[PDB]
Amino acid sequence: SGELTPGISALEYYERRIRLAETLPPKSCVILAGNDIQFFYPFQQENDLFYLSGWNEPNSVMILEKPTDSLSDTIFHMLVPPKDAFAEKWEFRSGVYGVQEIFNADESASINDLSKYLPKIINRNEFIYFDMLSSSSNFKHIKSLLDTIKPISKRIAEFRKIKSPQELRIMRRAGQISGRSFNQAFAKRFRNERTLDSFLHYKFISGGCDKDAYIPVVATGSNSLCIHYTRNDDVMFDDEMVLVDAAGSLGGYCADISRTWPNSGKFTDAQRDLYEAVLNVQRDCIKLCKASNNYSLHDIHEKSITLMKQELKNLGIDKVSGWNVEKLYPHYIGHNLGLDVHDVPKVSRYEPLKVGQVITIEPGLYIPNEESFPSYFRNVGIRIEDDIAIGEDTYTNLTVEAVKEIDDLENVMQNGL
Ligand SMILES: [Mn+2]
Ligand SMILES: [Mn+2]
């Protein structure tokens, strides 16, 4: 109650628009074209528009106008599909009076009026904040009208990368729901990737999430070497481990979890040695996620490379010809996380992490089927991923519920919950 979207009140959405208007010159207008229905897939709103309004309907356009240097003169425009009894019955729209009473649009009109509504705002402003390079139908519309125009998405990204305390909590909720789902999967046996896939999906939704945050990875055995494996339909065998990358989303905010565990419910000595190597690197990289350390995301990645090389050296598999650490650990340490899984990709990887940012820490080892490696290591892929909120002098593991220590994993797998 009092919320506009799950976890976020209408007051925070208003304060986000105020913060953006605090960076805009007089006589400016920000134009954001929402997404359309993709024929029909579950609707994904343009996240910059959703971040500033909470509006989750297709075929919509948002305009934030700053006529003077005063923050109280700002006008929040919303052009939406019209409140239509016949259209709503076949296709429930909030209408033009709901978008003002619920979503707090100072001014609104039907999306049909776009060609007669937008130019009057454009003509009375000097700076037009619109990304001429995205696509939506209103985007192709709005762009043709514009044939000073300034980009806006990256400026919004600098705000989105710093999560508010309310954003951190709803992401904590998504991570906790997703994490407890993994624990329930640990306690059960699965003979096929699709059964484990559909199980976690049901636990995400029934646990309280709206949808999957992303297309899940359920890769058993040698399938774990395929970094982008999504088929999730292979038989699972007793001797191998399964790599699962899956998480739920809540109110538009994404969690992101990777766990690897043996299908038999018990680690072999070989599986233990490889798993602890990845867990050692992940634990040490998570400990760096304090803003007082002034590390950038790239700093942590390069430290993850150094840490992984030492783990390979401890395992004696660090000097295989043609298989340096960048071929056994061939991806980045992580990424910002928020309304998008790979959130705010335009912010700098090289600037120090700040309080409120949420990044993943997901190192991995993927040993090829080469005779130059020990046979008990070949075709074994491991990734361990958690969502870390950056704090002043500490951090918050948003997905800490999902166990990952070997003793914790084997306790759940063999004794249940
Ligand atoms: Mn992931
Ligand atoms: Mn990730």
Curated annotation (Swiss-Prot):
A GO-annotated cellular component: nucleus
EC id: 3.4.11.26
Main location: nucleus
CDD domains linked to this entry: Prolidase
Residues forming coiled coils: none
Matching InterPro entries: Aminopep_P_N (IPR007865), Creatin/AminoP/Spt16_N (IPR029149), Creatinase/aminopeptidase-like (IPR036005), Pept_M24 (IPR000994), Peptidase_M24B_aminopep-P_CS (IPR001131), X-Pro_dipept-like (IPR052433)
PROSITE patterns for the chain: PROLINE_PEPTIDASE
Catalyzed reactions per annotation: The enzyme cleaves the 36-Pro-Pro-37 bond of cysteine desulfurase (EC 2.8.1.7) removing three amino acid residues (Tyr-Ser-Pro) from the N-terminus after cleavage by mitochondrial processing peptidase
GO molecular function, one term: aminopeptidase activity
UniProtKB keywords: Aminopeptidase, Hydrolase, Manganese, Membrane, Metal-binding, Metalloprotease, Mitochondrion, Mitochondrion inner membrane, Nucleus, Protease
Bilayer disposition of the protein: Peripheral membrane protein
GO biological process, one term: protein stabilization
Requisite cofactors: Mn(2+)
Domain of life of the organism encoding this protein: Eukaryota
Binding site for Mn(2+) 2: 245, 256, 385
Name of the molecule in the record: Intermediate cleaving peptidase 55
Organism: Saccharomyces cerevisiae (strain ATCC 204508 / S288c) (Baker's yeast)
